[PDB]
Amino acid sequence: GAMGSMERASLIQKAKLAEQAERYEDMAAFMKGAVEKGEELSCEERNLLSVAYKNVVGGQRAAWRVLSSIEQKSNEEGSEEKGPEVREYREKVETELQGVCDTVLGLLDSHLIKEAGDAESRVFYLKMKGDYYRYLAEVATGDDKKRIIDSARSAYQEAMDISKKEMPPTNPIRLGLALNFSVFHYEIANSPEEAISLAKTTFDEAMADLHTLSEDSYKDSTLIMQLLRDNLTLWT
Amino acid sequence: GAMGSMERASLIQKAKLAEQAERYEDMAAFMKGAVEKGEELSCEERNLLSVAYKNVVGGQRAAWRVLSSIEQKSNEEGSEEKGPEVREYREKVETELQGVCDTVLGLLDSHLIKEAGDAESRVFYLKMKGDYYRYLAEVATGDDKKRIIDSARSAYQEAMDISKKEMPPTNPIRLGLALNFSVFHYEIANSPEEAISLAKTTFDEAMADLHTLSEDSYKDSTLIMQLLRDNLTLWT
Amino acid sequence: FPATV
Amino acid sequence: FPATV
Numbered sequence: 001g002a003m004g005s006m007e008r009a010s011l012i013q014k015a016k017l018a019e020q021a022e023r024y025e026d027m028a029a030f031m032k033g034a035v036e037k038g039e040e041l042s043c044e045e046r047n048l049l050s051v052a053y054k055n056v057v058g059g060q061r062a063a064w065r066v067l068s069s070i071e072q073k074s075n076e077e078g079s080e081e082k083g084p085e086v087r088e089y090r091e092k093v094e095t096e097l098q099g100v101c102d103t104v105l106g107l108l109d110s111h112l113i114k115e116a117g118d119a120e121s122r123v124f125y126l127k128m129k130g131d132y133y134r135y136l137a138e139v140a141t142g143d144d145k146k147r148i149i150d151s152a153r154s155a156y157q158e159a160m161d162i163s164k165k166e167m168p169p170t171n172p173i174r175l176g177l178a179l180n181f182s183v184f185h186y187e188i189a190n191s192p193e194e195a196i197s198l199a200k201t202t203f204d205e206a207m208a209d210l211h212t213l214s215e216d217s218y219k220d221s222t223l224i225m226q227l228l229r230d231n232l233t234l235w236t
Numbered sequence: 237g238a239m240g241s242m243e244r245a246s247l248i249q250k251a252k253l254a255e256q257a258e259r260y261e262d263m264a265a266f267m268k269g270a271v272e273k274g275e276e277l278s279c280e281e282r283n284l285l286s287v288a289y290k291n292v293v294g295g296q297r298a299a300w301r302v303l304s305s306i307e308q309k310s311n312e313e314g315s316e317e318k319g320p321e322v323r324e325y326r327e328k329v330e331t332e333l334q335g336v337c338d339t340v341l342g343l344l345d346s347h348l349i350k351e352a353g354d355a356e357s358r359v360f361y362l363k364m365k366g367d368y369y370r371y372l373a374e375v376a377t378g379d380d381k382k383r384i385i386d387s388a389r390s391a392y393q394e395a396m397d398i399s400k401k402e403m404p405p406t407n408p409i410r411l412g413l414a415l416n417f418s419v420f421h422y423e424i425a426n427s428p429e430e431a432i433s434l435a436k437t438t439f440d441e442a443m444a445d446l447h448t449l450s451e452d453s454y455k456d457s458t459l460i461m462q463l464l465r466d467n468l469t470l471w472t
Numbered sequence: 473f474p475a476t477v
Numbered sequence: 478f479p480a481t482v
């Protein structure tokens with residue numbers, strides 16, 4: 001890999017610079033190189049990895065949605081035939097998105113998840129696995145769509161099981177996992193009631209544990225709680 | 237080139253889609269392919285070309301400035317030595333920026349400028365030539381910095397000479413050229429008085445010709461006039 | 473679109 | 478930074 005000659009510490013340093021410069025593709029490439037050194041990631045390093053790829057795939061998903069909407073409009077009655085270009089370019093963006101998702105999934109499988117024994121790391125990686133299978137599911141239309149959806153579900157469910165056993169209900173990783181799994185239920189699994197029940201129960205159980213927290217922990221937990229409330233407001 | 241197999245019209249169609257999706261690197265690649273077909277560009281197509289590369293290099297310049305500021309801070313008294321990484325990454329971004337500038341300059345030289353006979357096209361391309369040499373000048377520190385600055389000046393000056401002979405003082409291309417050449421004087425040539433004089437005279441001469449314009453032309457001209465006023469306000 | 477982290 | 482087009 002092109003980062004094979006760069007020191008681990010230098011890749012991490014450069015990922016932080018790339019973040020400051022809003023160079024998320026570079027950030028992701030640096031973090032991929034750091035993962036490929038083979039050592040486990042610290043909390044801070046896991047956050048760099050996630051931020052980099054979230055921002056890269058986020059931009060691809062937004063572009064894919066713009067192009068998919070144009071394509072859908074082209075297939076309505078009365079729309080003038082304009083040739084294969086809209087489909088081709090949506091396919092191009094889609095293939096690039098799938099590539100990024102496959103890259104992330106590959107890092108998780110080789111070998112981040114299997115080396116992650118502490119609950120905080122294992123849950124974090126399994127949440128990522130669910131997230132990147134969810135992004136694959138968003139664009140899937142073929143023979144494998146059900147298996148892709150089930151891969152996302154399975155990863156999220158394993159993360160949920162660990163999180164409920166091992167982490168307090170206010171833990172930001174537990175909260176973020178539940179937020180995203182709830183979105184999976186609403187948007188991917190056609191299960192809005194499950195989505196709502198999960199968001200509500202997660203919010204309420206967190207609320208009941210806030211009394212245990214420092215001011216700084218309270219700030220972290222309540223920020224994600226508000227995202228749960230925001231989704232509940234959208235959905236009810 | 238990778239776009240050699242795609243129809244000109246399809247490249248233009250896809251550039252427009254890429255713009256809608258805010259995929260400016262793709263937009264620029266499509267427009268490069270369209271230029272390389274060898275035919276002259278229409279007004280609309282020249283605008284696509286310019287928007288694509290403006291957005292790509294704009295992002296690179298913003299990143300370069302973030303990194304250059306970090307680097308400068310590292311070289312202050314009392315700053316802890318952190319190794320070569322900040323310089324390396326600023327160099328990486330810089331080299332990519334220079335590459336984009338060289339690509340644009342190459343399209344202009346082979347063969348957009350030489351085929352452009354109408355004032356509106358020739359001025360537009362010569363302005364672009366000045367702009368991309370200006371971006372090279374922003375990062376230049378070596379033996380060639382003076383020649384790079386002079387290349388920008390010469391391109392802008394040829395565009396100004398044509399524009400003054402052939403276009404009305406409200407023409408948006410004439411206005412935009414003057415705006416940018418004024419910034420060149422202020423930021424690159426260490427000539428703030430020249431910058432201010434050019435912006436003021438351009439504004440005032442435009443103001444005196446607005447009476448000749450339709451509502452729609454008036455809107456176009458006054459928008460750029462306001463940019464001239466904005467710079468004058470910054471500089472005085 | 474709904475919020476995710 | 479100053480405005481350019």
Ligand SMILES: *CC(=O)NCC1CCN(C(=O)C2(Nc3ccc(Cl)cc3)CCNCC2)CC1
Pocket residue numbers: 042043044046047120124127172173174175176177220223224477
């Ligand atoms: C290493 C570690 O513990 N990482 C968890 C951090 C918790 C706080 N936090 C956040 O609250 C934000 N991101 C986020 C990402 C993933 C998960 Cl599972 C939860 C929270 C910070 C950015 N805005 C959203 C919340 C950072 C990660």
Ligand SMILES: *CC(=O)NCC1CCN(C(=O)C2(Nc3ccc(Cl)cc3)CCNCC2)CC1
Pocket residue numbers: 278279280282283356360363408409410411412413456459460482
């Ligand atoms: C083909 C042609 O005539 N292009 C000139 C257009 C004039 C109107 N216009 C603008 O006002 C904006 N861009 C711009 C770009 C270059 C120049 Cl030299 C002048 C103006 C539109 C975007 N915001 C800034 C003004 C588009 C180009």
Ligand SMILES: [Mg+2]
Pocket residue numbers: 007008
């Ligand atoms: Mg080493």
Ligand SMILES: [Mg+2]
Pocket residue numbers: 091094095
């Ligand atoms: Mg496909």
Ligand SMILES: [Mg+2]
Pocket residue numbers: none
């Ligand atoms: Mg349950």
Ligand SMILES: [Mg+2]
Pocket residue numbers: 243244
């Ligand atoms: Mg043809």
Ligand SMILES: [Mg+2]
Pocket residue numbers: 327330331
């Ligand atoms: Mg250099």
Ligand SMILES: [Mg+2]
Pocket residue numbers: none
């Ligand atoms: Mg003069």
